[PDB]
Amino acid sequence: SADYSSLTVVQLKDLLTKRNLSVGGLKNELVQRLIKDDEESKGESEVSPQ
């Protein structure tokens, strides 16, 4: 999630291509995009109480 921001634009763009993510956004956009996708895959915090 944070390691992405540490990577270069080319590096981030490469990971996005492999992940099939939009690389049109700025570096920060690429980081949040990878962060969201990674968090979403893990399940993310979302439950419906009853």
Task: Give the domain extent around 12.
Answer: 1-50
Domain CATH for 12: 1.10.720.30
| H-state helical runs in the chain | 3-6, 9-19, 27-42
Cβ burial, residue 7 (10 Å; 0-12/13-18/19+): middle
Residue pair 12/20 in contact by the 8 Å Cβ criterion: no
Number of domains in the chain: 1
Give, rounded to a whole angstrom, the gap between the first and last alpha carbons of the chain.
32
CA distances from 16 to 38, 44, 47 (A): 11, 20, 28
Calpha distance 45→50 (Å, rounded)? 16
Calpha distance 17→19 (Å, rounded)? 5
